């Protein structure tokens, strides 16, 4: 089979500058002088969107920012300049040989300005306590970069076990990220202690954003 | 263009499942069609292709002999018969219009239908209202312990789209957990009703938890 190897698994570029994504094929994707390589743009919750067909042909409706070039085995997708709504995962695909194969994809993220997280701690729901469980949620909304740190503190202690995290995809408008840290415990252990803390260490501030509550 | 695929469901390994795709707005009979899926790892994989008349069918070796792409040009519907299902078949199946005269790649995709191939049983989710230290106000919703995916979490029936961050479900040993934060103004809550809503199709669950202050 023909394997498609895409350069930059992920690429971070500033708004207003160009991006270059490569796609190398293990075998020629050419036939009859035409290159059967295709480029797609996939945003979260939506199916791939055709940007360029046959290496260099711009699909109608697609802004001129996008352009394609290459032949035989080496291909390139160029976004110039990169706009805020361009954040997505780009895939290359060959249709020269059966079976048709796709590249692993290249996630494009915008180098937006630094922004501190908006931490919000949420104690266990009364309804959840009836089930014998106790999850303390902590939302860290709108921040950049993606790399952040959450350290849970139960009665001053740094609880390491039972933390289920989840990051959202970079927002298409403000170019920020959001994170949810969840410390899951049993109701018995939850009632054993009193103070629950959710600390957020980020590059925007030396002092971590502490958010806690006294159980009552 | 306008491809609505259906039939996605949780099936046991080695089982069978058939997918459908309603094509409307164009002359379906003249177009070559295809099925393309996307694994949980976000990997795009071509599944099958069938000619306008249905005489020519193409399938990758990992799918050939188990999957069968066919179509009904009378009612304009594309089909995908899946048999001897494997764990690797777990993916989002997109109905794609392949071509007419030229190879223009995959120009029109459907919104997809999720097919989950697992031995785990269907478990209904537990929706929990997340009042802040209820006392701009941020609120939250906890959908814990459910299988399989997905769930449709919405705020105020969709009328509340501002400041909503619905986080990706994380798998905690055969059971997913999804969260969502809605950030509104102090004059909007608890003054107005903000209802933490959820819906799980696999279990026929439809829970509406109202965010009540603490």
């Amino acid at each position: 089979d023909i394997v498609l190897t895409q350069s930059p698994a992920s690429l971070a570029v500033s708004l207003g500058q160009r991006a270059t994504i490569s796609c190398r094929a293990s075998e020629s994707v050419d036939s009859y002088g035409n290159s059967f390589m295709h480029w797609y743009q996939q945003k979260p919750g939506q199916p791939p969107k055709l940007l360029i067909y046959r290496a260099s042909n711009l699909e109608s409706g697609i802004p001129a920012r996008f352009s394609g070039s290459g032949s035989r085995t080496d291909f390139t997708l160029t976004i110039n300049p990169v706009e805020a709504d361009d954040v997505a995962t780009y895939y290359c695909q060959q249709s020269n040989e059966d079976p048709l194969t796709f590249g692993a994809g290249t996630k494009l993220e915008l180098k937006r300005a630094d922004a501190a997280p908006t931490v919000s701690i949420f104690p266990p729901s009364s309804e959840q306590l009836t089930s014998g469980g106790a999850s303390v949620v902590c939302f860290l909304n709108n921040f950049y970069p993606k790399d952040i740190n959450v350290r849970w503190k139960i009665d001053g202690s740094e609880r390491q076990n039972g933390v289920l995290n989840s990051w959202t995809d970079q927002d298409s408008k403000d170019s920020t990220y959001s994170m949810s840290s969840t410390l899951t415990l049993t109701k018995d252990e939850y009632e054993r202690h009193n103070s629950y803390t959710c600390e957020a260490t980020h590059k925007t501030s030396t002092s971590p954003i502490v958010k806690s509550f006294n159980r009552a | 263009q306008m491809l609505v695929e259906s039939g996605g469901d949780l099936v046991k390994p080695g089982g069978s499942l058939k997918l459908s795709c309603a094509a409307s707005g164009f002359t379906f009979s003249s177009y070559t069609m295809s099925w393309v899926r996307q694994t949980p790892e976000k990997r795009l994989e071509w599944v099958a292709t069938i000619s306008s008349g249905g005489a020519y069918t193409y399938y990758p070796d990992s799918v050939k002999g188990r999957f069968t792409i066919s179509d009904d040009n009378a009612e304009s519907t594309l089909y995908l018969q899946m048999s001897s299902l494997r764990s690797e078949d777990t993916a989002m199946y997109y109905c794609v219009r392949r071509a007419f005269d030229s190879d223009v790649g995959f120009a029109s995709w459907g919104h997809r239908t999720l097919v989950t191939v697992s031995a785990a049983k269907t478990t209904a989710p537990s929706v929990y209202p997340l009042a802040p230290v209820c006392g701009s106000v941020t609120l939250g919703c906890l959908v814990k312990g459910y299988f399989p995916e997905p769930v449709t979490l919405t705020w105020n029936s969709g009328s509340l789209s501002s400041g909503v961050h619905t986080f990706p479900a994380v798998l905690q040993s055969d059971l997913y957990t999804l969260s969502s934060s809605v950030t509104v103004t102090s004059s909007t809550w608890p003054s107005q009703s903000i209802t933490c809503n959820v819906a799980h199709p696999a279990s026929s669950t439809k829970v509406d938890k109202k965010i009540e202050p603490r």
């Binding site: 035409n34 249709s95 059966d98 | 070559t32 292709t49 005489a55 392949r98």
Partner: peptide, 13 residues
């Protein structure tokens, strides 16, 4: 030709 003879559109005549 805008279609390949080794692909999934080889029937496309």
């Amino acid at each position: 030709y805008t279609t390949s003879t080794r692909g999934d559109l080889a029937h496309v005549t």
